[PDB]
Design a protein around this ligand. Structure first.
Ligand SMILES: Nc1ncnc2c1ncn2[C@@H]1O[C@H](COP(=O)(O)OP(=O)(O)OP(=O)(O)O)[C@@H](O)[C@H]1O
Ligand SMILES: [Mg+2]
Lengths: 268, 15
C-alpha cells in the first residue's frame, strides 16, 4: 500500500493494453514522477513474466541518457513502476516543430542515443522499440539531454547469443531480420538508430508506404535513397554513418561502440 | 512522398 499512501495521481501521459502512464506527486516530498500503472487483476502467467522482465531491466539500467526507475510497488490488483518525470516532451514533437536538425544538433542528439543503446547492450538489454516517440527531452531548452524510455518491449540476451525472440517493434523502425523472422539481437537497435538519424537530418523517414506489405518489402531490401532537395547539402560522412546503420546484414551492421567512434560523431 | 507520422508498437505479427 506504499503507492496509495504516499502518491497522488494527475493527468494521463499514455495508455497500453493493461497499463496507463500518469504524472503523480509524492505528496510529502513535493516531487513529481511518471507512474506506469499495470492492472494485475487476473493477469496471465506470461503477462506477469513481462511485467517482471520490464521491472528487472529498468532496475539494471543506470545511465544519464536512460529514464531512471525510482521505485517498484506491488499493491492488491495494481503494480506501480515509478520513473523520474522527463518534462521536455518526445524527440518526435521536437523534430516536427523544428522540421529537421542541423548536422551538429543531429550528431549531438544521435551521440546521446548511441550512449544509451551502448549501455543497454553492455548490460544484456535489447530495446527492440527505438524511435523518436521513445526518446524524451530533459527540458524545452536547446541542447537538453535525451533519455531512452519505454522498455515495455525490451528483452534480456546472453552476451552475443541471438535467437528468434518473436515479432515486436514499430513498422517504420523494424529491422530486416525481425521482418524476415530470422534470429536477431543487439543489431536491431542500430537499424532503428539509422531510421532516427535519417529523420533528424531531413525530417521524414527513409521507409514509408500506405501499404504495410510494400513498407516491409522496402525495409527488407534496404530501398532508401537521398533525394533532392533536402539531401543536397548533407555531408557524405552523415550519409556514410546512416548507410552503416541501415546495413541489411546485421553481422556487418555498425555497432553502438563503433558508431560512437565514427568521425561524424567523434571528430566534434 | 515519405511523411513523419506517429506509429503504434506491435507485440505480435499484424498483417
Ligand atoms: N519518465 C517519463 N516522463 C514523461 N513521459 C513519460 C515517461 N516515461 C514514459 N512517458 C510517456 O508515456 C507514454 C508511453 O506510452 P506509449 O504508448 O507511447 O508506449 P510504448 O511502449 O512506446 O508504446 P507505443 O509502441 O504505442 O509507442 C508516452 O507518452 C511517453 O512519452
Ligand atoms: Mg512510447
Amino acid at each position: 500500500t506504499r503507492f496509495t499512501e504516499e502518491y497522488q495521481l494527475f493527468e494521463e501521459l499514455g495508455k497500453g493494453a493493461f497499463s496507463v502512464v500518469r504524472r503523480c506527486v509524492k505528496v510529502l516530498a513535493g516531487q513529481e514522477y511518471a507512474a506506469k500503472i499495470i492492472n494485475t487483476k487476473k493477469l496471465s502467467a506470461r503477462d506477469h513474466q513481462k511485467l517482471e522482465r520490464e521491472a528487472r531491466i529498468c532496475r539494471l539500467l543506470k545511465h544519464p541518457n536512460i529514464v531512471r526507475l525510482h521505485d517498484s510497488i506491488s499493491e492488491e490488483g495494481h503494480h506501480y513502476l515509478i520513473f523520474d518525470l522527463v518534462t521536455g516532451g518526445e524527440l518526435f514533437e521536437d523534430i516536427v516543430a523544428r522540421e529537421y536538425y542541423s548536422e551538429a544538433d543531429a550528431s549531438h542528439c544521435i551521440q546521446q542515443i548511441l550512449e544509451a543503446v551502448l549501455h543497454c547492450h553492455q548490460m544484456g538489454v535489447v530495446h527492440r522499440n527505438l524511435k523518436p516517440e521513445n526518446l524524451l527531452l530533459a527540458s524545452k531548452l536547446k541542447g537538453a539531454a535525451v533519455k531512452l524510455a519505454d522498455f515495455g518491449l525490451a528483452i534480456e540476451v546472453e552476451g552475443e547469443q541471438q535467437a528468434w525472440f518473436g515479432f515486436a517493434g514499430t513498422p517504420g523502425y523494424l529491422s530486416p531480420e525481425v521482418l524476415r523472422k530470422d534470429p536477431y539481437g543487439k543489431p536491431v537497435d542500430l537499424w532503428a538508430c539509422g531510421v532516427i538519424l535519417y529523420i533528424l537530418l531531413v525530417g521524414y523517414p527513409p521507409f514509408w508506404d500506405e501499404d504495410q506489405h510494400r513498407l516491409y518489402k522496402q525495409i527488407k531490401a534496404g530501398a532508401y535513397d537521398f533525394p533532392s532537395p533536402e539531401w543536397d547539402t548533407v555531408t557524405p560522412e552523415a550519409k556514410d554513418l546512416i548507410n552503416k546503420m541501415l546495413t541489411i546484414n546485421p553481422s556487418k551492421r555498425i555497432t553502438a561502440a563503433e558508431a560512437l567512434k565514427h568521425p561524424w560523431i567523434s571528430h566534434r | 512522398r515519405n511523411k513523419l507520422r506517429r506509429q503504434h508498437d506491435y507485440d505480435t505479427f499484424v498483417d
